[PDB]
């Protein structure tokens, strides 16, 4: 059991202590999850119970009925239930919107003083009802000036109550919210927490618990077998021994198990987690080992697909090319045998833009430029390599696969270009005149404080136009408007060290939960 040797990761998948046993009683307690969330219960209690469903990774199960239930408490007339009472406001609030059903802000008036447009000092005692706040106020969109202050509030009165909380489960969820949001937060990760608190919740459905862990095992045993085929594609490029990306196809899988989860979608994560190894890899390549000659003929060979000079190259730059082009090849292939969609054109194209912006980079620091802010993050969302990932993710995934449709994607339209430009900006708050925090200081002569403030800001900012695209009809479907999401969510868990991380990967990947 070590996370960083390939020898047990290849070995993964052989062998699972998962059993059909465990598949049929899977099958019997996901009958009566899913009566619970259809079935009878007190409005706030309803949607305490899906909101522990989501926390605990279920959505994927109960999508259908968790927004059936919601629709029914939206559509009530009885609001005496949630109208004054800030925890039931704000959880409605969030569950409502997360779910596609429109919410305004102004539910939170009722809970300022109308003088100051400042949160009344008498919430400053209610903990759930602050936190229920906090929750939510990242559901907001831009203008939405209400939930902006309710952040500002709940967030400070949340720093001052955390010590006075007398429930060491309550204490630990809300240490938890102020380190991130739950809407920020990545599910599957969050699941395997969320499952260990939500046992020694008070409210806790056994039902429900028993269910979570199950379905975590089961999920669990799909994610070994993955690793284990990847593993032994890893080893078999020969990039494993290449002097660097250390721990690469690893880091990649478990930033992939961010993206996506669900067992249905285990091929697709396959390719994503192939194609982010081979990022890592050649970000490397680009960054510390290559010589200008080596790294334009590298970008002039992909921009080509034309692999006639490729032994000009010395092996450990000619092994990742080529094991760049076999896998893009091998991704569009799958498209055209699957989909009925040749992908190459679009992988190719993908990794052509993103050794362009990497040799951009290269060429900036040779030459001592300083980008602007703009200049700069107009490269690096393209550099961080999500529009690869994300344009990978669509080609694979989209029903009736077109070049219109493709082209659209690829072209970046703003749902795609704020998730790019989100996982680029956290990566660089996650620690040079090339990175964002270092580009607005020379733009602005901020201070480190200041120029990192206004970044964060841009964080907030694009989240917001990222809710608000998700309430607009879009020329996008599931699986592809929650992978855009997801990324972010993966970019938030993993920039927050080598403890915490094997940590992450041993109990979400390798460990089973006890049943
Ligand atoms: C630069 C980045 C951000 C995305 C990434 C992951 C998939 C390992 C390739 C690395």
Redesign the pocket.
Same mark, same amino acid.
């Given at each position: 059991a070590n996370l960083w040797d390939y020898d047990f990761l290849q070995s993964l998948g052989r062998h699972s202590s998962v059993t059909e046993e465990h598949v049929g009683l899977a099958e019997k307690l996901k009958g009566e999850v899913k009566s619970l969330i259809t079935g009878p219960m007190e409005p706030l209690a309803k949607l305490e119970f899906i909101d522990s469903v989501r926390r605990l990774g279920l959505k994927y199960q109960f999508e259908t009925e968790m927004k059936e239930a919601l629709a029914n408490i939206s559509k009530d007339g009885y609001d005496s239930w949630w109208v004054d009472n800030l925890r039931a406001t704000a959880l409605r609030f969030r569950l409502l919107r997360e779910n596609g059903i429109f919410v305004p802000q102004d539910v939170f008036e009722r809970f300022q003083n109308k003088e100051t447009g400042k949160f009344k000092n008498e919430l400053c005692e209610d903990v759930k009802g602050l936190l229920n706040l906090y929750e939510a106020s990242f559901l907001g969109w831009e203008g939405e000036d209400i939930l902006d202050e309710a952040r500002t509030f709940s967030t400070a009165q949340l720093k001052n109550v955390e010590g006075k909380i007398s429930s060491p489960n309550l204490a630990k969820i809300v240490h938890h919210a102020l380190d991130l949001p739950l809407h920020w937060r990545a599910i599957r990760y969050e699941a395997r927490w969320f499952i260990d608190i939500y046992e020694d919740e008070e409210d806790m459905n056994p039902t429900l618990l028993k269910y979570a862990k199950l379905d975590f095992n089961i999920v669990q045993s799909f994610h070994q077998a993955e690793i284990g085929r990847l593993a032994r594609w890893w080893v078999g490029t020969g990039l494993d021994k290449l002097p660097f990306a250390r721990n690469g196809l690893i880091?990649?899988y478990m930033?992939?198990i961010g993206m996506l989860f669900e067992p249905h979608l285990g091929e697709v994560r396959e390719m994503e987690a192939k194609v !982010?190894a081979l &990022?890592?890899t050649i970000?490397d390549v680009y960054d510390v080992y290559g010589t200008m000659e080596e790294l334009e003929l590298f970008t002039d060979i992909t921009e080509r697909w034309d692999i006639n000079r490729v032994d000009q190259l010395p092996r450990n730059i000619r092994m990742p090319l080529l094991t760049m082009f076999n896998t893009s090849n091998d991704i569009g292939y799958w498209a055209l045998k699957e989909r009925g969609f040749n992908g190459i054109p679009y992988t190719a194209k993908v990794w052509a833009d993103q050794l362009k912006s990497y040799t951009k980079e290269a060429k900036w620091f040779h030459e001592g430029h300083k980008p602007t802010l703009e200049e700069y993050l107009e490269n690096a969302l393209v550099s &961080? !390599?999500?529009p690869n990932?994300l344009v990978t993710s669509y080609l694979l995934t989209v029903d009736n696969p077109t070049k219109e449709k493709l082209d659209y994607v690829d072209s970046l339209p703003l749902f795609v270009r704020a998730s790019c430009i989100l996982?680029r900006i956290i990566?660089d708050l996650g620690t040079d005149n090339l990175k964002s925090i270092q580009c607005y200081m020379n733009e602005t002569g901020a201070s480190q404080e200041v120029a990192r403030e206004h970044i964060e800001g841009l964080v907030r900012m694009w989240w917001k136009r990222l809710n608000k695209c998700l309430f607009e009809p879009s020329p996008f479907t599931e699986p592809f408007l929650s992978f855009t999401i997801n990324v972010v969510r993966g970019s938030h868990f993993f920039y927050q060290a080598e403890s915490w991380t094997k940590n992450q990967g041993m109990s979400v990947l390798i460990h089973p939960i006890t049943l």
């Open positions: 880091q990649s930033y992939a !982010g &990022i890592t970000d &961080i !390599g999500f990932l996982c990566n």
